[PDB]
Amino acid sequence: SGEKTRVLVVGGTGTMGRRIVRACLAEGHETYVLQQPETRVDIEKVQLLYSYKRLGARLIEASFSDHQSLVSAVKQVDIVVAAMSGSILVQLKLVEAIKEAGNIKRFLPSEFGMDPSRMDQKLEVRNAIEAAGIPHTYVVGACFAAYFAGNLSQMGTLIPPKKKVNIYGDGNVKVVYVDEDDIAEYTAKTLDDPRTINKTVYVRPTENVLTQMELVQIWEKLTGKELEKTNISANDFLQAGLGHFYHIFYEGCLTDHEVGDDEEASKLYPDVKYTRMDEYLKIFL
Amino acid sequence: SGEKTRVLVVGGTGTMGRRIVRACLAEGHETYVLQQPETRVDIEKVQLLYSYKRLGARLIEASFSDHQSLVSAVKQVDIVVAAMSGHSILVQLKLVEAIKEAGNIKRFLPSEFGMDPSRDQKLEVRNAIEAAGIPHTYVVGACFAAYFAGNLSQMGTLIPPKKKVNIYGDGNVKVVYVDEDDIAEYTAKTLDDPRTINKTVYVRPTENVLTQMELVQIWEKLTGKELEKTNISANDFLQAGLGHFYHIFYEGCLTDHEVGDDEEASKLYPDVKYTRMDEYLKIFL
């Protein structure tokens, strides 16, 4: 009990933040969630925060505009994980508090997407972490399955289309589709792993490196219906999100480099039986 | 299984609606959830909807602007429960027209779950329900605990204040504070109860009939801290939100008429061990 790693989760009601909270709990960490002052009446956010208490988490009230409150929060833990909307730069206030507190064994900033160093506020946050001497882990390299797999990678929707589907280019560019729950579980496992201190950890589970046509074909196999496919050229492709989609599906930024086993989450943590996309898609049938 | 009541929940990703979905499942009803077209990318809404399928619910796609899709949906069930946001209410007039044409529905519980509007959009929905001869149950008479108890009935916040509290009048007007989960469980139990056909069901669990001062004193006993109290007179209090608090806390509209055992949820369903407010408030300590 006294040898549990203590983790503060910042952004604990976010999409990835809420999963990190539960993953830290499931991993046995003594888990604390930053409780920011209310900005409005927001019942869903409040009930989510207090539901963590029933699971055994603690809430720590603090405000990013009150440096003392951040220092006091981080003094109660060994590791900080942030998962802010991308409010990336608000983490600079967090870095300053960590630097002053002095007790933090590791900081995991709000990454969980493309590696920005291969492409940013995130790099600005990385530079402050490193300048301060705060030990770090950067979790990168996967598309959230909810945002790119459940919709067969169509923009503007989160569910599989009924008959028509746009194919980017020839849909033969490899993409990394990972269940958000698995990203959170890999994060909970890696944050006190001595092997990943001051490392970038790539989330690239081998069987989930799929081209978009491969993903569409997983779905066509589950439904028994071929979809009507329209290919979109890079020029015709060139609104929120275009030019994330471009880098991913045309440039293949998630798969244009190899990753060693010592830096890849599914090899670092082989007991995590990550969700393959055929299983992920079954919920939509 | 063939003896299950089939229930369609309209508004199933809302605050009350999500609880009604789960309470209908926990009661053993064969549960359907209206799936409206996406109006945006909404990760939380989509994932809540599909999470119901893992619990055994089914999704029926329909749209309020497509009359025939609503007719198709309600023909698949026996009972419809609506819990739309408090325009939104008037959308139910479409639903009534679809239920009237479909002809198969045994009961419709419209979106009530608060002040009795017989004493306006809710009343207009009631009139259309009754004109169409659709059997109904109106579930009324309680303040959601999350909106009125966890904040000690202060406005603008959902958690207990740390030092100061506004008391409305002398704070000796009886209010009804009920955990939303209990409201949803009463709703699931009453929707096929022969005793409540064409009736109003008041959710007034006896030990949760409390003045604001009694609620504040419950909190002070749990915390051992006396709060600084400012009494706000009726005249000074004296907008829709303000009008709601005025009717509840100054006019006592939830408790000024007594209710018979045959029309009050806690007496009709005495097996529901409703959360008393001393237990409700403990999650905030």
Ligand SMILES: NC(=O)C1=CN([C@@H]2O[C@H](COP(=O)(O)OP(=O)(O)OC[C@H]3O[C@@H](n4cnc5c(N)ncnc54)[C@H](OP(=O)(O)O)[C@@H]3O)[C@@H](O)[C@H]2O)C=CC1
């Ligand atoms: N396919 C992929 O790889 C994806 C990658 N990502 C990345 O994941 C990370 C998290 O994004 P996501 O989970 O969608 O985040 P969210 O939109 O869910 O927001 C997460 C948390 O941000 C906090 N927040 C927002 N604004 C502020 C603010 N001004 N001040 C203080 N706190 C604030 C809030 O914390 P609180 O809960 O305390 O209120 C919020 O809950 C991001 O880096 C994102 O780039 C996200 C989507 C897809």
Ligand SMILES: NC(=O)C1=CN([C@@H]2O[C@H](COP(=O)(O)OP(=O)(O)OC[C@H]3O[C@@H](n4cnc5c(N)ncnc54)[C@H](OP(=O)(O)O)[C@@H]3O)[C@@H](O)[C@H]2O)C=CC1
């Ligand atoms: N203290 C009390 O007694 C309380 C009483 N209430 C009452 O409870 C009932 C539900 O309120 P609440 O739980 O807060 O509702 P919500 O605001 O949580 O929303 C409920 C559902 O409304 C549907 N909706 C909203 N607009 C539309 C629209 N134009 N067209 C179609 N569907 C729409 C959506 O359903 P979908 O899920 O399909 O997307 C939404 O999920 C109301 O009658 C309210 O007056 C509410 C608060 C406190």
Ligand SMILES: COc1cc([C@@H]2OC[C@@H]3[C@H]2CO[C@H]3c2ccc(O)c(OC)c2)ccc1O
């Ligand atoms: C995969 O790496 C990232 C992903 C994103 C995720 O693409 C930006 C976002 C996002 C997911 O939501 C994607 C998006 C933008 C516009 C859309 O219409 C969309 O539809 C699913 C999805 C954000 C930052 C990243 O580094």
Ligand SMILES: COc1cc([C@@H]2OC[C@@H]3[C@H]2CO[C@H]3c2ccc(O)c(OC)c2)ccc1O
């Ligand atoms: C019977 O109770 C009702 C409650 C409301 C709930 O009071 C109107 C609303 C609402 C909850 O959110 C309440 C509210 C409005 C403004 C606020 O500042 C507020 O702070 C908690 C709370 C809606 C309709 C009702 O019939």
